[PDB]
């Protein structure tokens, strides 16, 4: 039941069209 957790839902749909991650 966190705060920022569910805020990660917001950008997950709106901002996250592609993914941005470095393997290393």
Structural biology method used: NMR
DSSP code, position 15: T
Q: CA-to-CA distance for 10 and 12, rounded, in angstroms?
A: 5
Q: Which tokens sit at 22?
A: 């470095």
Q: What is the DSSP letter of 16?
A: -
List, in order, residues 6 or more apart from 4 with CB less than 8 Å away: none
Q: How far apart are CA 8 and CA 4, in angstroms?
A: 6
Extract the runs of DSSP E, i.e. beta strands, from 1-24.
none
6-20-15-17 Cα dihedral, nearest 10 degrees? -110
End-to-end CA distance of the chain: 31
Burial class (CB in 10 A: 0-12, 13-18, 19+), 23: exposed
Residues in the chain: 24
């Amino acid at each position: 039941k966190w705060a920022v957790k569910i805020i990660r839902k917001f950008i997950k749909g709106f901002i996250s069209g592609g993914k941005r991650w470095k393997y290393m």
